[PDB]
């Protein structure tokens, strides 16, 4: 029924609100709170390992909160563990980078990072200017579309719930979950007159891979660096 | 297919 589709939309939004780490209103309220030049210089003078370690902890924390998101979605716990692991492996870092747009301010090209807004410059010590620039771009393109909370909650669910990921054992059970979300998302977009937004979405697979690679690298090499 | 992420995700799925 119509209210049944409406139920699932509000419940995906609920699950998103509960697992999104920081509230949008807090993020929006803190736009004026910007790192000073002194504070920028502090981050830039950190060792490459110090800065990577911090950001990998954040990236890790983000992935865990996407897992919590997935756990609350309708049929996810009912899938076999193998499928749960396949969907989250293939999908979580992409969800993380889409969530990231909410902490991005497109007016001043800054992002909320450890309690204040800062630009690309903050992340010089990472030694990956191109990756940082690309992620800022992706965030900029996402913010421009001016997602509702519902749009993000539903779109990120669809990033996860995908019956096309290699190595599922129960494709059909994923397909039903994916279709149900598609049906719900389609109704919501139609009633809001937002059908066209998903045509405009910037490519996220490559970037997410590189974030995932870096996370893997830091854990792999942790014994050649100071105790965490 | 990255093994770093799988470990985080496995650990997170418990409990
Ligand atoms: C390669 C670099 C490493 C550092 C960084 O950018 C990418 O990693 C990025 C991953 C981001 C988080 C993703 C989840 C978001 C959920 C959302 O509801 C609220 C904001 C959250 C917590 C984001 C904050 C942001 O500062 C980050 C740590 C970015 C950081 C600037």
Indicate the proportion of strand residues of chain B.
under 5%
Order of helices and strands of chain B: H
Query: How many runs of DSSP E, i.e. beta strands of chain A?
Result: 3
Termini separation of chain A comes to 52 Å
Folded structure, characterized:
Chain A: Belongs to the nuclear hormone receptor family. NR1 subfamily. Chain A: It is found in: Nucleus. Chain A: This is Nuclear receptor ROR-gamma. Chain B: Belongs to the N-CoR nuclear receptor corepressors family. The complex is a heterodimer of chains A (228) and B (15). With 228 residues, chain A is mostly helical. In chain A, helix 1 crosses helix 8 and helix 4 crosses helix 9. In chain A, a hairpin with a 2-residue loop joins strand 2 and strand 3. Chain A has nine helices and three strands. The longest helix of chain A is centred in the first third of the chain and has 25 residues. Helices cover 62% and strands 4% of the residues of chain A. Chain A has a three-stranded antiparallel beta sheet. Chain B is mainly α and 15 residues long. Chain B is elongated, with a radius of gyration of 7 Å. Chains A and B meet through helix 4, helix 5 and helix 9 of A and helix 1 of B. The site of ligand 82R has 18 residues of chain A, from helix 4, helix 5, strand 2 and helix 6.
List the helices and strands and how they pair.
The complex is a heterodimer of chains A (228) and B (15).
Chain A: H1 2-19, H2 24-29, H3 37-44, H4 48-72, H5 81-99, E1 104-105, E2 110-113, E3 116-118, H6 129-144, H7 149-160, H8 171-192, H9 205-220
Antiparallel strand pairs in A: 1-2, 2-3
Helix pairs in contact in A: 1-4, 1-7, 1-8, 4-5, 4-9, 5-7, 5-9, 7-8
Chain B: H1 3-13
The complex binds the ligand C[C@@H]1CC[C@@]2(OC1)O[C@H]1C[C@H]3[C@@H]4CC[C@H]5C[C@@H](O)CC[C@]5(C)[C@H]4C[C@@H](O)[C@]3(C)[C@H]1[C@@H]2C.
PDB class: transferase/ihibitor
Keywords: Inhibitor, Ternary Complex, Nuclear Receptor, TRANSFERASE-IHIBITOR complex
Assembly: dimeric
């Amino acid at each position: 029924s119509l209210t049944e589709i409406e139920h699932l939309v509000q419940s995906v939004c609920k699950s998103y609100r509960e697992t999104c780490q920081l509230r949008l209103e807090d993020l929006l309220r803190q736009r004026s709170n910007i790192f000073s030049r002194e504070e920028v210089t502090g981050y830039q003078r950190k060792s490459m390992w110090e800065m990577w370690e911090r950001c990998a902890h954040h990236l890790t924390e983000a992935i865990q909160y996407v897992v919590e998101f997935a756990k609350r979605l309708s049929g996810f716990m009912e899938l076999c563990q193998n499928d749960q692991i396949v969907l989250l492996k293939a999908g979580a870092m992409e969800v993380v980078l889409v969530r990231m747009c909410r902490a991005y301010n497109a007016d001043n090209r800054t992002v909320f990072f450890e309690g204040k807004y800062g630009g690309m410059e903050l992340f010089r010590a990472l030694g990956c200017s191109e990756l940082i620039s690309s992620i800022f771009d992706f965030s900029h393109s996402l913010s421009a579309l001016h997602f509702s909370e519902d749009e993000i909650a539903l779109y990120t669910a669809l990033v996860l719930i995908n019956a096309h990921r290699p190595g599922l054992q129960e494709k059909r059970k994923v397909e039903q979950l994916q279709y149900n979300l598609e049906l719900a998302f389609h109704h919501h977009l139609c009633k809001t007159h937002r059908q066209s937004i998903l045509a405009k979405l910037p490519p996220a697979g490559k970037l997410a891979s590189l974030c995932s690679q870096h996370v893997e690298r830091l854990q792999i090499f942790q014994h050649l660096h100071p105790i965490v | 297919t990255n093994m770093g992420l799988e470990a985080i995700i496995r650990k997170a799925l418990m409990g």
